[PDB]
Amino acid sequence: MPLLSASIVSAPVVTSETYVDIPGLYLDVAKAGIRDGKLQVILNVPTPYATGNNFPGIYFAIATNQGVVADGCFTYSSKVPESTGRMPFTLVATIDVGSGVTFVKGQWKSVRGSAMHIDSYASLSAIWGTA
Amino acid sequence: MPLLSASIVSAPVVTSETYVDIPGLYLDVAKAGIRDGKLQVILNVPTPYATGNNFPGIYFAIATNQGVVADGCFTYSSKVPESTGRMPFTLVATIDVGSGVTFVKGQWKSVRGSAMHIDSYASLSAIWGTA
Amino acid sequence: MPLLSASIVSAPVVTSETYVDIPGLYLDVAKAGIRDGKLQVILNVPTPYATGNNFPGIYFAIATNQGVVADGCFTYSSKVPESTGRMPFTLVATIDVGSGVTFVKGQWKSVRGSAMHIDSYASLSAIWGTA
């Protein structure tokens, strides 16, 4: 099966100065017997929000056992937003499995001390391609 | 053909307390003779906006004949935004066709009574994968 | 190989009243011997920002040698935002290669004179499908 997916509807609220795994957003590539070719990986966090005192936001990353392959963030445009609105976020990266990839995961990291909120659907998806 | 797509450039402006189809964002899976395996579905609404009086926004969903499989929203961070800016939105879900899926559609639902606006490109895409 | 990708971590800051290529976001389809079937193309700019004096934003497009196939934008909800926050943006389009497509690129265009900022990861991805 060339389509892999994991999805969640919540995670414990946390702050982090470093990239930390988003629990449940994990694809086991080795366990699927995929050892070569490429994966197009999509991290989709459609409804996150950040709480903080200093232009809040969330960094998200796609990581393998080799670490972060791609990342990005959303941030609010106000020091302390009136309400910390829902800021849809998608990240897309293509990785060579041949180089020794055995898992893929989503990770997150605070912007300026923000608490990080997922309280609804979020997914981590991959499509396997071979020549 | 394992790639399916539908796209629109507008829809009638409406409010809805329930998920209602976004006209044109519909993939006919049965008609394509796809009866087994998985679909990775992307709902891409890159340039929506919501008009309202109370922190406006839009919920979007991916639905089949079996109902909603994934959803999320954007919301503004001000009670009545200065201007209701364009809030890009993407949603990604992977569904088992074997379980009896015959169509896939995008749907939307008001946040707090918002009118819902698409006046430019939006797409619903799927990639079919089989083991 | 049915998966194509290009990624960047920055681009020179520019303004543009027209769609102009985002340097590095280019897939050479002809060079890959792909002459028929479909491509699902994702333009992923997860961490852009716009600087301007009049509700800033960025239009993004997916273009081929035949021009723009899909586009959209983000805009801020304040005339001059307190801080020009990071506004994640994804665009998804499906194109018929048979119709004479030889390359795919990401492009951008100012909203109301905005300077356009990418200073971190951004990607252009494609999956090739044939019947």
Author numbering:
A (entry chain A), B (entry chain A), C (entry chain A): 1 to 131
Task: Give the text the authors published on this PDB structure.
The bacterial lectin BC2L‐C expressed in B. cenocepacia is an interesting drug target involved in bacterial adhesion and subsequent deadly infection to the host. BC2L‐C as a virulence factor binds to carbohydrates present on the epithelial cells of the host.
The asymmetric unit in the P63 space group contains one monomer and crystal symmetry was applied to build the trimer for comparison with other structures. Only a minor difference is observed at the surface loop (Asn52‐Phe54), that is involved in the interaction with methyl group of N‐acetylgalactosamine (GalNAc) in the complex with Globo‐H. Likewise, small differences in the conformation of the N‐ and C‐terminal residues were noticed due to H‐bond interaction between them. Analysis of water molecules involved in bridging fucose to protein indicated that the more buried one (W1) is conserved in all structures, while the more exposed one (W2) moves by 1.9 Å in the apo structure.
